[PDB]
Symmetry: C8
Subunit: 123 residues, 8 copies
């Protein structure tokens, strides 16, 4: 299949929301390929809408998945290394799926020379 289908568009959003990679999604029988989905993502606002939301939902699912990957890692060198890679990939990706929620968090206390006020000279 490779034609626009609202019912598969929905079906797509559901699997994504559950955390499943789009690759592992389209790889399903009767489903549009990645390329087609990205094509639709440029010809269906009604889709781009259900996709952005599904992406934030997918992130929330992945957030819980990282605890399981870390905690249930097989205590073998290569397996722990693989688990670390799976977790690091997800952490990095979550920040891009929902920046406001999963991006880095820093509090910067801004002070001037020697802890005094910030000194500025203007021209």
């Amino acid at each position: 299949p490779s034609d626009y289908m609202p019912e598969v568009a929905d079906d797509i959003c559901s699997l994504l929301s559950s955390g499943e990679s789009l690759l592992k999604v389209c790889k399903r029988p009767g489903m549009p390929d990645k390329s087609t989905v990205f094509r639709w993502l440029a010809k269906h606002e009604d889709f781009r809408d259900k996709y952005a939301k599904a992406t934030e939902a997918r992130a929330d699912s992945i957030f819980e998945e990282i605890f399981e990957i870390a905690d249930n890692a097989i205590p073998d060198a290569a397996e722990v290394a693989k688990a670390r890679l799976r977790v690091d990939t997800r952490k990095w990706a979550l920040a891009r799926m929902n920046p406001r929620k999963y991006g880095d968090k820093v509090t910067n206390e801004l002070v001037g020379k020697d802890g005094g006020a910030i000194q500025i000279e203007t021209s």
Copy 2:
């Protein structure tokens, strides 16, 4: 369990508050699967509010837990690597669960050229960037 059940939702919040992760909670007897919990969250504001509070408590619980995971790590290479992964995952997650409390902390002493004042020159716009 597919239908929204307040009593089970309440239990979920209590377990999360104590530091347990959602996927682990959903494996307990009589608990809805994760997909179902997210669905409940999506359609029940009462649960969302209580879950947000549970998330704050969960972070405070994990903050104490990371000391235990590190200190009690079996002194075996792979076991220490796994303990490190479990701690790093929690550290990262804590900052997102409560950014104000658990985000990074930096004090930046801001100075200018050669340790003097910060030198700023303002000029009229040279291009149409408005």
Copy 3:
């Protein structure tokens, strides 16, 4: 036990102050569980007060503990790796227990293009 007790609240602050994790604290006979303590932390300002101070005191204790963990590490691969993890966990936690004191420290010399003045155009 699981009722409010000012005497155990104090007892709690003491162990914390010495650097002991709350987990290893409540784990003591007759002591309230973590959950209860966090509950109290929302029903006793008189407690929230003695707890915030105890947390800064606990940090000061942990600060000295990291030198001992590093310097007395058994010179074996896994043991040194464990010692590093114990130290890294404490360093990260100290910044959160007392941000002004244990957070990162940076001095930024701010200059403009080519070392000249910072150039700004406003609209």
Copy 4:
């Protein structure tokens, strides 16, 4: 193939859009070598515009691919190290292919001395920095 051929250029854009890297594409049958592609880019605006669009699509494709590379890594030390290298290279590249979407994300809570307001003192210039 040395002469600019729109049909081959179009194919290149489609392959890149799907996530394939340029050097790998140039190894396919009938494809121009990399140097030639860069030359085509240099002298054909039509190709440059379509290639820029293909780059955006390529990044979206690699973003999904990194999950697969990590999750399907053979659990062997060297194989995991290679998977990690393949993922780190893609992460770095994604930020450059689409900075807005894939660059780092940070929220900075800015406060001043002791958690109060940011203290700023302005003074007349003390040196000729204009």
Copy 5:
């Protein structure tokens, strides 16, 4: 030793000034335990002031010590890893003991779009954030 004893406190300050850590100092003959030292600090301003000075001196001493720990490390894997841990711990601690002297140092050349001036557009508040 539980009662506050100025002479012992003075000794503690001298030892710390030379670079020794508090827990190691407290293991010496006749020294109060760490908990006791913190208690003394809490209730004797004279000791707190002298201890703060001792902390500055301690940092200057550790700054020289890190070169020695690195340079004299036994060339054995675990021994080098331990030396690295001892040095990293000291580096981190130095910045906190004397932020002005030992914090990170960065020079940021600040420029605007395309290397030109920093472009700023000011607008009236669009939301009630005051």
Copy 6:
């Protein structure tokens, strides 16, 4: 050879553009040495021009090279370590060859205390 030659200057830019290190370039028969090239880079604006452009072109070539180095690494510990070093060196260098294009990318959401407005007091 060690005299100014526009034809070798061009020849130089070509190899660079293809991604080849200047070292591996001058190392070619009849070609000026590195030192001489850097000398020319201070006596031929017509050269400094064709060189800056060639450097940005070289970066674009290297950008594609890193995917090949990573993906085709021999799955052996030392070989993967070498591949990682080759890639890391190139990533670092690309940012310097074309800063606007290959430098780090960060989006900073700037907010004030507790997520409110940034509080500033001036004197």
Copy 7:
């Protein structure tokens, strides 16, 4: 060689310009020891100016050298680790030799709360910080 000798100083500048490090240069036949070179630098402005130029050239030379060190690394664990150390040392040094050219490069897209404008509230000073 202890006395300042322009011809030897000139040679030093040429060697450094080509990428050689000072300690290695000082091991060559007839060269002054490092301490002596620093002494010459201290008291001869002519040498300092030429040495500063040589430093810029040295950095441009090392920039090309790092590709070679990485690409030609013997594929042996310790040899690759040493190559990595040699490259990391040069990267760090390059930024200091020519900060403008070799320092880190970052583009920061600055936005405010929720992706909107940066919200700033100014207030009268509440403490004597002038």
Copy 8:
């Protein structure tokens, strides 16, 4: 010895300038101990002067030392690890000995949302 001596103060500055750690300096026969030197550093401006300069000179010496440590490292795992630690310690220390010269260097291109102008609202 443990009395103020201008001649040993000078002797001190010389060794430091050559890059030698103060520890390895005082450890010399007839020389004041570290503690005493730090004491003098608070009772002799004439000393604090010759010391700050010596520290910047020491940094310049150490800067050249790191190339030698890296390039001449014995190609053995532990020896390379030790060499890396010696170099990392020196890099970190150089930034503190001369911040303006050896501190980190970053050029930040500051832009606003979507690459447009930086948007600011004031109250």
